Amino acid sequence: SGAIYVGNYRVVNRHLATHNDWANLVWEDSSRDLLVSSTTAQGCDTIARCDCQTGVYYCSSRRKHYPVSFSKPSLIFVEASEYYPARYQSHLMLAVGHSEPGDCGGILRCQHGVVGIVSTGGNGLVGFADVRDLLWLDEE
Ligand SMILES: COCc1cc(C(N)=O)no1
Ligand SMILES: [Zn+2]
């Protein structure tokens, strides 16, 4: 589990979005595993605006943050997980690291801020849903 709290937006994995999220929906995209909802209180996070390929992510299944190198966001085939069938996911970055389903929502960060959230795992990789292209998160 986990979210990004930027301005008055909550960014969650689409597959972990709650009824309140859907009832306060700003934007969602199944192909990216992302959903954004409204918040009453302003959040503490800053979104990275960069093309970094190194950062640090939180792995809840290890209670640890790990430094990783990651691929640029792309359209990637993802094998079946407990929460999605095998399918293509867009805007996905991969690193070598540990990720189980419950790790979804952990933040990947670089020197510029939040890069994305854990979205995929298995076979010794962790996949992150990028948010750095979502420039509208920084206003309004
Ligand atoms: C004026 O409150 C609007 C509102 C409600 C919510 C919510 N419940 O998620 N977020 O913003
Ligand atoms: Zn960066």
Side-chain angles (χ1 to χ4, degrees):
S1 59
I4 312 169
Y5 294 101
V6 52
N8 285 268
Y9 299 121
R10 164 176 148 88
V11 187
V12 287
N13 301 91
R14 189 179 181 277
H15 71 275
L16 295 179
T18 66
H19 164 79
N20 182 77
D21 286 326
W22 284 100
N24 290 277
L25 180 63
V26 174
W27 169 82
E28 54 86 22
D29 181 321
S30 169
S31 72
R32 298 180 66 145
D33 185 39
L34 287 180
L35 183 146
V36 181
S37 62
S38 303
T39 67
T40 57
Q42 291 190 285
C44 292
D45 299 318
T46 298
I47 312 301
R49 305 292 177 200
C50 69
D51 62 1
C52 288
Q53 283 188 265
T54 70
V56 172
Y57 84 101
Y58 183 58
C59 181
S60 71
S61 67
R62 295 281 179 277
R63 295 185 181 116
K64 280 190 190 64
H65 294 257
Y66 294 99
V68 287
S69 301
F70 55 89
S71 60
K72 296 184 173 189
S74 347
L75 182 60
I76 302 295
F77 187 70
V78 181
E79 297 292 349
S81 69
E82 83 178 30
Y83 49 92
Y84 285 130
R87 77 189 193 127
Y88 280 91
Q89 182 158 324
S90 64
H91 301 264
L92 184 69
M93 300 170 290
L94 291 174
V96 177
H98 186 67
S99 173
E100 296 173 40
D103 288 326
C104 284
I107 280 170
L108 174 66
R109 65 185 76 239
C110 66
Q111 71 181 97
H112 303 101
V114 174
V115 173
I117 51 172
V118 175
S119 180
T120 75
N123 289 318
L125 307 185
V126 50
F128 310 94
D130 183 53
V131 298
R132 297 176 288 186
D133 64 323
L134 302 176
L135 310 188
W136 55 260
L137 288 171
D138 291 348
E139 65 221 2
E140 137 82 20

